[PDB]
Amino acid sequence: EDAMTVLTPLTEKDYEGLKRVLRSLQAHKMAWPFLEPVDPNDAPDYYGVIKEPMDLATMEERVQRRYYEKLTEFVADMTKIFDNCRYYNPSDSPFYQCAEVLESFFVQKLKGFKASRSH
């Protein structure tokens, strides 16, 4: 529940489940802008505006290194991806439209992850 999301440390099973949320996100049609971090070669000024950059491969690495102790931390990193994108980009950007779609998809998958967890 909300009680678990905050209090319950991520169990090695939960870490299996988060790799599967993450893979389904890497598999979405509209995840392509976010699979890897923003090439500082190709967008030099981005890292001088975005304070907390994040991307899907960085998140997979933090999962592999069991870097998250609670699920709130995982959700917070994911949310950076979409918030940074909509902030940096004009709304007519294809990166923006992908953030809106894929965040909505992530919300669903997160409900699945929480419901499966309290069982």
Ligand SMILES: CN1C[C@H](Nc2nc3c(c(=O)n2C)CN(C(=O)OC(C)(C)C)C3)C[C@H](c2ccccc2)C1
């Ligand atoms: C690793 N790179 C990272 C890229 N991801 C990304 N790049 C930029 C922004 C962003 O928010 N993201 C998420 C903001 N941006 C930008 O300033 O665009 C303005 C319109 C000027 C506002 C540059 C996509 C790139 C790529 C490109 C084509 C096909 C596949 C991958 C793969």
